[PDB]
């Protein structure tokens, strides 16, 4: 048996755009993401799947059924976000004493009168509905992490088709400090409205994906799909200071912990001669960002308005990345990690998911202990899961990664919970509905939820607070011989 | 939801030779089967795997742990056998007024003095141990079906190496009416000793396999592996009258129901022009045997000493057999049913097990309703399961076959329980330990039992007496794209 601290919580994470829509009256047509996935040219290009989020799993209407099943599964923590677009579907007045040309945003003043004026423009129907959802959540005894931002922006801040086309005269998302300013005020406003229900806050989810896929990895179908190293850097600079200004904003109205959730990989050497390549990749993908919002270090200078703006770190982990040293520096290798064939085996002989992602639970121990030793900030595993409609690999994936969290705690790392991605199947961005990450399988015609066997395994873990003796054999690699390869 | 009658019981079946040995002091070295699987020539030929049953799962010593897990899983019925060899490890005196040359055995007299004399030769340590096992079983509220015979014979009745070599001067198993006579007395003796613990009896398990694989399908590694159509028929004739004489024997000491357990396939037409081939195959594999022990019809004559010797039918079902009409008659086709590649797909595109057996749950409905319409005797599904160490297919296999029993009941068939093969992994005859049929995975080094996710699924079925809404999606074919093919 592998037992966890009495205070450790098992639960799940979920995103609004991916799970809310699907029931009558639930559609949110007012985001950059909604425009992006409906765009005829994006569909013709195959940048998006043609599946549409308004045919989704229906959490907006059916949240009591989601929460019923989570409670029956023994879950004790959830991380959800509010959709900015639902709260402010129409534009806010452009800020007066605000200079859009100033590169740096070092303060965004929050006060009671500003909050009461913002309240005039908020959608009270959406606010009340979210209160009902979150009250129902809390009434099941679930600890609540509220995340402010999980990729879609109001269209009045970002028209992604205009930017895709190379037109930068309109609302340009994270390329504009207007978005930085409004995100800070949005985050303060939500904490002001919901602090009585929230246990901890996250400002954002996977900001590195926003900048990396939106402006470099443009085949991914992440908006606005405008290929530019320069603008990727500008977007990440703005998202960093937006995190800091939202941290300060929330702290002006709340005493509760404020963290951030990040897309992590475990960087692994192709050969024993590649350890410096690993360090370089960790610098280029992880430490540059966290040194900025924890130590204030940015490109070198120290900004005192960035330093110390983090209480905890959310680790989102799915697989590794294998790197080797080059003359110029380092490169990642296809055939491992997230660059494998779907439903196959990696070059290392490890099974791959429906998404082509390699089975590599030891990477989660690596990431947790690396963060702990560098910053000594406590952590949640805020995402971990697998695309696996058939449920062949998920029982092993679940138990093996939970075991690696147990290992990390035994080594001294302060890890306070494990949140699986996800409770139920949902809309997986440019891939649509075909990638199924749920413990629960969704029938999108009826919106009914079904328990995959891994959900029964998870109930055993969560209700016992342990990997029990009876399921310890699942701490192993899914047998590869019976799988496609 | 698919609900079952309140009296319907879910449980499991298990065999002594396959599961008992593995703990200190549990070895039974005195069967034809033990000699057969240790034989150097059989091992060199690859007729047997080289795995040895004395390294097995250890039910003889660890039965309380088996039963603990079955009780936790909600199971309410078990079918087990006593091993003849354990009860009579040394030979009995040859019967005096018994003519070994008489082809027909129409009566085997049982009386109290005969039973008390038999008792003098019985192993009291084994008898007491079985009583302890069966008492523990009954103390969990499990209904108990006791089967008398599940293939191994005492070596003093069958030396299979001598017969393999073409020497018929020694103890020749089912080729000898001595075995018929002694089986009837053995069955009466066991019922006399255990009737207070038994709810229903079966005389034997899969008699058609004994005759078919022992004397025709000789590549299978089933003893004595002597290829002869003539002797296959002689063995089946003797096993039929042995069933009848054991039926009468048990009924001389007990009022409880006595049935038989049979190896079934669902015979399916390759094309719509092949329905007569199906009927012929059903005649040649199923009806000839049951017409003999129910209607007394044998080759045509009616024997009044065979007629009416059956109260219930145990259906053992794993997959189908596809047949087509030939000029001479009919033939079975490779690439379907039990003649597929392992961990692949059949010619029909259906997934195959670790044993090469095709996924075909509708066959179970076919077999149950065919038996019911012909004989109107009530039934148990006494075996159903899959070789699947990884547990990829078993959740679907379990739910889909249980659903087909629900269908059969809805159509009028009197089916009173479903017994999965098996609770735990065990020694699978000539294949050794590599074919894993358990809901529970066995570590053969430690003898520890682990719950595969399908065991958690089975607990949901058994504790609710139903396929619940939450697992209804498992009534479907395992997705083939992610599996080996
Ligand atoms: F299809 C997609 C992909 C990435 C995204 N980020 C925000 C909305 C959205 C939609
Ligand atoms: F390996 C095997 C195969 C079939 C059998 N039948 C009885 C014992 C035995 C052993
Ligand atoms: Cl990372
Ligand atoms: Cl630090
Ligand atoms: Cl669907
Ligand atoms: Cl049959
Ligand atoms: Cl009849
Ligand atoms: Cl083992």
For chain B, the structural domain boundaries read 1-485
Q: Are B62 and B26 in contact (CB under 8 A)?
A: no
Which one of B352, B451, B478 makes the best mutation probe of the A interface by having the most chain A beta carbons within 10 Å?
B451
Which residues have a Cβ under 8 Å from the Cβ of A182 and sit 6 or more positions away? Answer: A92, A157
What angle separates helix B177-194 from helix B229-251, to the nearest 10 degrees?
30
Question: Cα dihedral angle (B184, B185, B187, B192), rounded to 10 degrees?
Answer: 140
Tell me which residues of chain A have a C-beta less than 8 Å from any C-beta of chain B: 343, 354, 388-392, 395, 441, 443, 448-451, 453-454, 456-457, 460, 469-473, 478-479, 481-485
DSSP type of residue B50: S
DSSP type of residue B315: E
Which residues have a Cβ under 8 Å from the Cβ of B320 and sit 6 or more positions away? Answer: B265, B266, B267, B268, B336, B337, B358, B360, B363
| B120 has catalytic annotation | no
DSSP type of residue A358: B
Residue A327, helix vs strand vs coil: coil
Alpha-carbon distance of B148 to B28, in angstroms, equals 17
> Strand pairing partners for A77?
A11, A143
Structural method: X-ray
Ligand 1 pocket, Cβ-based, cut-off 6 angstroms: A 33, 36-37, 48, 151-152, 221-223, 429-430
Alpha-carbon distance of B426 to B430, in angstroms, equals 12
Sign of CA dihedral B419, B394, A361, A203: negative
> Strand pairing partners for A79?
A13, A145
Q: Are B318 and B358 in contact (CB under 8 A)?
A: no
Alpha-carbon distance of B75 to B64, in angstroms, equals 14
Alpha-carbon distance of B282 to B280, in angstroms, equals 5
Nearest atom of ligand 2 to the alpha carbon of B17: 8
Alpha-carbon distance of A125 to B164, in angstroms, equals 84
Pick from A371, A464, A485, A350: which is nearest to A76 by CA?
A464
**Antiparallel, parallel or unpaired: β B301-302 and B297-298:** antiparallel
DSSP type of residue A428: -
- Interior angle at CA A237, CA A233 and CA A239, nearest 5: 115
Alpha-carbon distance of A239 to A241, in angstroms, equals 6
Question: Is residue B433 in contact with ligand 2, taking CB distance under 6 Å?
Answer: no
Q: Are B70 and B423 in contact (CB under 8 A)?
A: yes
Q: In this structure, which residue's CA is closest to atom 2 in ligand 2?
A: B429
Query: A40 to each of A21, A46, A49, A50, B421, how far by Cα in Å?
Result: 21, 10, 11, 9, 54
| Contacts A390 to B, Cβ<8 Å | 392, 478-479, 482
Alpha-carbon distance of B131 to A127, in angstroms, equals 68
Residue A319, helix vs strand vs coil: strand
Q: Are B168 and B224 in contact (CB under 8 A)?
A: no
CA distance A431 to chain B (A): 18
Residue whose token pair is 């020749």: B172
**What six digits make up the tokens of A187?**
């985050």
| A383 has catalytic annotation | yes
Alpha-carbon distance of A57 to A69, in angstroms, equals 14
Nearest atom of ligand 1 to the alpha carbon of A213: 4
Query: B466 to each of A129, A199, A440, B167, B470, how far by Cα in Å?
Result: 36, 40, 19, 54, 11
Q: In this structure, which residue's CA is closest to atom 9 in ligand 1?
A: A33
Q: Are B363 and B268 in contact (CB under 8 A)?
A: yes
Which one of B396, B456, B485 makes the best mutation probe of the A interface by having the most chain A beta carbons within 10 Å?
B456
Residue A30: CB atoms within 10 A of its CB come to 21
Q: Which ligand is nearest to the CA of A55?
A: 5
CATH code for the domain defined by B1-485? 3.20.20.80
Tell me which residues of chain B have a C-beta less than 8 Å from any C-beta of chain A: 343, 354, 388-392, 395, 441, 443, 448-451, 453-454, 456-457, 460, 469-473, 478-479, 481-485
Pick from A20, A6, A13, A68: which is nearest to A262 by CA?
A13
**What six digits make up the tokens of A89?**
């579907």
CA distance B66 to chain A (A): 13
Interior/surface letters B69-83, b for 16+ CB within 10 angstroms, e for the rest: bbeebbbbbbbbbbb
**Would you mind telling me the total number of residues written for chain B in this entry?**
485
Alpha-carbon distance of B290 to B307, in angstroms, equals 10
Alpha-carbon distance of B260 to B406, in angstroms, equals 22
> Strand pairing partners for A143?
A77
Q: Phi and psi (nearest 5°) for A150?
A: -135, 45
Which residues have a Cβ under 8 Å from the Cβ of A86 and sit 6 or more positions away? Answer: A16, A28, A30, A123, A126, A130
Query: A452 to each of A392, B75, B197, how far by Cα in Å?
Result: 10, 21, 39
Alpha-carbon distance of A264 to A240, in angstroms, equals 17
Q: Phi and psi (nearest 5°) for A210?
A: -55, -50
Alpha-carbon distance of A44 to B216, in angstroms, equals 62
Pocket of ligand 1, candidates A430, A431, A433, A435: which has the most ligand atoms within 8 Å of its Cβ, to mutate? Answer: A430
Q: Are B129 and B61 in contact (CB under 8 A)?
A: no
Q: Are A244 and A296 in contact (CB under 8 A)?
A: no
Q: In this structure, which residue's CA is closest to atom 8 in ligand 2?
A: B33
Q: In this structure, which residue's CA is closest to atom 4 in ligand 2?
A: B222
**Would you mind telling me the total number of residues written for chain A in this entry?**
485
**Antiparallel, parallel or unpaired: β A330-332 and A301-302:** unpaired
Pick from B224, B218, B216, B89: which is nearest to B161 by CA?
B224
Q: Which of B20, B206, B358, B428 is catalytic?
A: B206
Resolution in A: 1.8
Strands, E assignment, B38-121: 77-81
Strands, E assignment, B106-199: 143-147
Which residues have a Cβ under 8 Å from the Cβ of A475 and sit 6 or more positions away? Answer: A396, A399, A400, A403, A467
In terms of CA atoms, which chain A residue is nearest residue B389?
A479
**What six digits make up the tokens of B409?**
């009941």
């Amino acid at each position: 048996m592998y037992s966890f601290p009495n205070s450790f919580r098992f639960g799940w994470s979920q995103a609004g755009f991916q799970s809310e829509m699907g029931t009558p009256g639930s559609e949110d047509p007012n985001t950059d993401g909604y425009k992006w996935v409906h765009d005829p040219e994006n569909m013709a290009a195959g940048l998006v799947s043609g599946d549409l989020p308004e045919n989704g799993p229906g959490y907006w209407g059916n949240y009591k059924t989601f929460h019923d099943n989570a409670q029956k599964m023994g879950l004790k923590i959830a991380r959800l976000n509010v959709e900015w677009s639902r709260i402010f579907p129409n534009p806010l007045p452009r800020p007066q004493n605000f200079d859009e040309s100033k590169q740096d945003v070092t303060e965004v003043e929050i006060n009671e009168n500003e909050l009461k004026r913002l309240d005039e423009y908020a959608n009270k129907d959406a606010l009340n509905h979210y209160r009902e959802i979150f009250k129902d959540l809390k009434s099941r005894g679930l600890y609540f992490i509220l995340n402010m931002y999980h990729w879609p922006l109001p269209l009045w801040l970002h028209d992604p088709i205009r930017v895709r086309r190379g037109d930068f005269t309109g609302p340009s998302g994270w390329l504009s400090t207007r978005t930085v300013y409004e995100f800070a005020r949005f985050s303060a406003y939500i904490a002001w409205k919901f602090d009585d229900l929230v246990d901890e806050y996250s400002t954002m989810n996977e900001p590195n994906v926003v900048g990396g896929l939106g402006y470099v990895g443009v085949k991914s179908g992440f908006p606005p799909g405008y290929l530019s190293f320069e603008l990727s850097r500008r977007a990440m600079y703005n998202i960093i200071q937006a995190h800091a200004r939202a941290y300060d904003g929330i702290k002006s109205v709340s005493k509760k912990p404020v963290g951030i959730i990040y897309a992590n990989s475990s960087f692994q050497p192709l050969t024993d001669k590649d350890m410096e390549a690993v360090e370089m990749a960790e610098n280029d993908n992880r430490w540059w960002f966290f040194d900025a919002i924890i130590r204030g270090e940015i490109t070198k200078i120290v900004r005192d308005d960035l330093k110390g703006r983090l209480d905890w770190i959310g680790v989102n982990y799915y697989t590794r990345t294998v790197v080797k040293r080059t003359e110029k520096g380092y490169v990642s290798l296809g055939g491992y990690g997230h660059g494998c064939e779907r439903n196959s085996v990696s070059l290392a002989g490890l099974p791959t998911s429906d998404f082509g992602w390699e089975f590599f639970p030891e990477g989660l121990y690596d990431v947790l202990t690396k963060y702990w030793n560098r910053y000594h900030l406590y952590m949640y595993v805020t995402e971990n899961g697998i695309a696996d409609d058939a449920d062949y690999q998920r029982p092993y994936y679940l138990v093996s990664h939970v075991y690696q969290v147990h290992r990390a705690i035994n080594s001294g790392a302060d890890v306070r919970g494990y949140l699986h991605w996800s409770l139920a199947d949902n809309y997986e961005w440019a891939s649509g509905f075909s990638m199924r990450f749920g413990l629960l399988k969704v029938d999108y015609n009826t919106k009914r939820l079904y328990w995959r066997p891994s959900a029964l395994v998870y109930r055993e873990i969560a209700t016992n607070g342990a990997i029990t003796d009876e399921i310890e054999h699942l701490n192993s690699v899914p047998p590869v011989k019976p799988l496609r390869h």
